[PDB]
Amino acid sequence: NSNICEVCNKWGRLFCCDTCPRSFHEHCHIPSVEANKNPWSCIFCRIKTIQERCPESQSGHQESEVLMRQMLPEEQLKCEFLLLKVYCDSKSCFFASEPYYNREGSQGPQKPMWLNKVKTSLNEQMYTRVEGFVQDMRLIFHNHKEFYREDKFTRLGIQVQDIFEKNFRNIFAIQETS
Ligand SMILES: [Zn+2]
Ligand SMILES: [Zn+2]
Ligand SMILES: [Zn+2]
């Protein structure tokens, strides 16, 4: 197994996947690494199993259909995995914890949002459809772009949104387009 966390790339108290060489801090994995379970398989491995059990699940889909899906266990898992792919990027630090807004010439957003809040909402089964999870994720970056206006810091929202959107298209097998 790897000797660093797959998510944050640091050493520490690591839990090792039984079916692949990845390792994780307890609260870096999503969901948080399960108490018992020998063997244990990470979220990467659980997603790959879904695909292997239903190869047709990789055929192209329309985003509008994916958003309307109810949050049954496979969709729950796919959203957890997508959230974890965003935490995998180091620039997620800027969007992890609760923001505050005091900048001359700007007003904070009406509905603040952040990654740890989405993480808690998934854990608590607060989303009934994929659409709820995706709307809160996109709101994080939209809030950032609107608040930072012409400051070059706006670019961090574009960058992490691009990670989100590429992983969304991959995980949910969105039909490729020009
Ligand atoms: Zn970690
Ligand atoms: Zn694994
Ligand atoms: Zn099938």
Side-chain angles (χ1 to χ4, degrees), residues 21 23 28 57 69 76 79 108 112 114 128 138 143 151 153 166:
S23 309
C28 284
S57 70
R69 297 176 189 167
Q76 174 81 28
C79 295
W114 59 101
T128 59
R138 290 171 168 167
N143 285 349
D151 193 293
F153 190 64
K166 283 181 190 270

Coordinates of all heavy atoms in Angstrom, one line a residue, residues 21 23 28 57 69 76 79 108 112 114 128 138 143 151 153 166:
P21 N -3.9 -0.5 -3.8 CA -2.8 0.0 -3.0 C -3.0 1.4 -2.3 O -2.1 1.9 -1.7 CB -1.6 0.1 -3.9 CG -2.1 0.0 -5.3 CD -3.6 -0.2 -5.2
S23 N -4.2 4.4 0.3 CA -4.3 4.6 1.7 C -5.0 5.9 2.1 O -4.8 6.8 1.3 CB -2.9 4.5 2.5 OG -2.2 3.3 2.0
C28 N -10.4 11.8 5.7 CA -10.1 12.1 4.3 C -10.9 11.2 3.4 O -11.5 11.7 2.4 CB -8.6 12.0 3.9 SG -7.6 13.4 4.6
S57 N -23.5 1.0 -17.7 CA -23.6 2.2 -16.9 C -22.6 3.3 -17.4 O -22.7 4.4 -17.1 CB -23.2 1.9 -15.4 OG -21.9 1.6 -15.2
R69 N -32.1 11.9 -10.8 CA -32.1 10.7 -10.1 C -32.2 10.8 -8.6 O -31.5 11.6 -8.0 CB -30.8 9.9 -10.4 CG -30.6 9.5 -11.8 CD -29.3 8.8 -11.9 NE -29.0 8.6 -13.3 CZ -27.8 8.2 -13.8 NH1 -26.7 8.1 -13.0 NH2 -27.6 8.1 -15.1
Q76 N -25.7 7.9 -4.1 CA -25.1 8.4 -2.8 C -23.6 8.2 -3.0 O -22.8 9.1 -2.7 CB -25.7 7.8 -1.6 CG -25.1 8.1 -0.3 CD -25.5 9.4 0.3 OE1 -26.6 9.9 0.0 NE2 -24.7 10.0 1.1
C79 N -21.9 10.4 -5.6 CA -21.7 11.9 -5.1 C -20.6 11.9 -4.0 O -19.8 12.9 -4.0 CB -23.0 12.4 -4.5 SG -24.3 12.7 -5.8
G108 N -21.3 39.8 0.6 CA -21.3 38.4 0.6 C -22.6 37.8 0.0 O -23.6 38.4 -0.2
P112 N -24.3 31.2 1.6 CA -23.0 30.7 1.7 C -23.0 29.2 1.6 O -23.9 28.5 2.0 CB -22.4 31.2 3.0 CG -23.3 32.4 3.3 CD -24.6 32.0 2.8
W114 N -20.0 25.6 1.4 CA -18.6 25.2 1.5 C -18.5 23.7 1.5 O -19.5 23.0 1.8 CB -17.9 25.8 2.7 CG -18.5 25.6 4.1 CD1 -18.1 24.7 5.0 CD2 -19.7 26.3 4.7 NE1 -18.9 24.8 6.1 CE2 -19.9 25.7 5.9 CE3 -20.5 27.3 4.2 CZ2 -20.9 26.2 6.8 CZ3 -21.6 27.7 5.1 CH2 -21.8 27.1 6.3
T128 N -32.1 14.4 -1.5 CA -33.0 13.3 -2.0 C -32.8 13.1 -3.5 O -33.1 11.9 -3.9 CB -34.5 13.7 -1.8 OG1 -34.7 14.9 -2.5 CG2 -34.8 13.7 -0.4
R138 N -22.0 23.5 -7.2 CA -21.8 24.6 -8.1 C -22.0 26.0 -7.5 O -21.3 26.9 -7.9 CB -22.8 24.5 -9.4 CG -22.4 23.3 -10.3 CD -23.5 23.0 -11.3 NE -22.9 22.1 -12.3 CZ -23.6 21.4 -13.2 NH1 -24.9 21.5 -13.2 NH2 -23.0 20.6 -14.1
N143 N -20.6 31.5 -5.9 CA -20.5 32.5 -4.8 C -19.1 33.2 -4.9 O -19.0 34.4 -4.8 CB -20.7 31.9 -3.5 CG -22.2 31.6 -3.2 OD1 -23.1 32.1 -3.9 ND2 -22.4 30.9 -2.1
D151 N -10.8 40.7 -8.8 CA -9.6 40.2 -8.2 C -9.2 38.9 -8.9 O -10.0 38.0 -9.2 CB -9.8 39.9 -6.7 CG -8.5 39.8 -6.0 OD1 -7.6 38.8 -6.1 OD2 -8.2 40.6 -5.0
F153 N -8.0 36.5 -7.7 CA -8.3 35.3 -6.8 C -9.6 34.6 -7.3 O -9.8 33.4 -7.0 CB -8.5 35.8 -5.4 CG -8.6 34.7 -4.3 CD1 -7.6 33.8 -4.1 CD2 -9.7 34.6 -3.4 CE1 -7.7 32.8 -3.1 CE2 -9.8 33.7 -2.4 CZ -8.8 32.7 -2.3
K166 N -15.2 18.1 -14.6 CA -14.5 17.0 -15.3 C -14.9 15.7 -14.6 O -15.2 14.7 -15.2 CB -13.0 17.2 -15.3 CG -12.6 18.1 -16.3 CD -11.0 18.2 -16.3 CE -10.5 19.4 -17.2 NZ -10.2 18.9 -18.5

